[PDB]
C-alpha cells in the first residue's frame, strides 16, 4: 500500500511541480504578479473520481 502511495505521489508531484507559465520572468509582469485560477493537484484531487 505504501509503495502504491509512493507511485501515485510521484504521479501527482510530477504533474504538479512543472515550471508554470505564471511563474516565469517574462509573464508575471503582464498581470499583477500571480493570477487566480486552477492548481494542477488541487483540481486533480478535487475531481472525486
Amino acid at each position: 500500500l505504501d509503495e502504491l502511495n509512493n507511485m501515485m505521489e510521484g504521479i501527482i508531484a510530477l504533474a504538479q511541480q512543472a515550471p508554470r507559465l505564471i511563474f516565469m520572468r517574462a509573464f508575471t509582469q503582464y498581470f499583477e504578479g500571480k493570477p487566480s485560477g486552477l492548481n494542477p493537484a488541487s483540481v486533480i484531487r478535487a475531481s472525486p473520481y
Binding site: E3, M7, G10, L14, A18, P19, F27, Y30, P35, G37
Partner: protein, 153 residues
C-alpha cells in the same frame, strides 16, 4: 371581379416589398450581432488564431505522458519502486520541460510581435487591443494546459 380581392393578389407587392424590408432588417441585425461578437473572440484576430492552432497541435504531448509504469509486471516491493520511479520521472520530466519551453517560446513570439508593432506605431486600435489582451491570452492558454495536465494525471 372574381380575382380582384383574392388575398395573395391584394398582397402581391405589399408582401414582396414589405418582406424585402423585413429581411433587410433581419440581415443587418445578424450583421451587427456577428460583428460585435467577432470583436470579442480570439479566432477573429489574425495575430492570435494561427499560433492558437499551433498550440492546439503542440499540446497533444500531454496526452502521451504515463506518469507511472501502468503495467501489471511481476514486480517486488523494490522492483516496483525502481520501475515505477523510472516511468514516473525519466519519461515524463523531459515532456514537462519541452512543453514549458515551447509554450514560453510561442507566447514570447506573440508578445514581442505585438509590442514591437506598438513601438513602431483602423488597425492601430486592433494592434493596441491585442497588446492589451496579451495577458488574457496567456492566462487562458495556461489554464488549458493545467486542465490537460489534471486530466492526464
Amino acid at each position: 371581379d372574381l380575382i380582384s380581392a383574392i388575398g395573395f393578389f391584394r398582397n402581391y407587392l405589399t408582401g414582396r416589398c414589405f418582406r424585402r424590408w423585413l429581411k433587410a432588417v433581419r440581415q443587418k441585425n445578424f450583421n451587427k450581432v456577428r460583428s460585435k461578437i467577432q470583436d470579442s473572440l480570439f479566432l477573429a484576430k489574425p495575430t492570435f488564431c494561427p499560433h492558437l492552432v499551433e498550440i492546439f497541435a503542440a499540446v497533444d504531448e500531454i496526452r502521451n505522458t504515463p506518469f507511472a509504469s501502468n503495467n501489471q509486471q511481476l514486480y517486488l516491493l523494490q522492483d516496483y519502486a525502481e520501475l515505477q520511479v523510472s516511468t514516473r520521472e525519466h519519461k515524463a520530466k523531459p515532456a514537462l520541460e519541452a512543453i514549458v519551453e515551447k509554450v514560453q517560446k510561442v507566447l514570447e513570439r506573440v508578445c514581442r510581435e505585438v509590442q514591437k508593432q506598438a513601438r513602431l506605431y483602423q488597425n492601430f486600435a486592433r494592434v493596441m487591443r491585442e497588446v492589451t489582451m496579451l495577458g488574457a491570452f496567456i492566462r487562458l492558454a495556461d489554464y488549458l494546459f493545467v486542465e490537460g495536465v489534471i486530466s492526464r494525471a
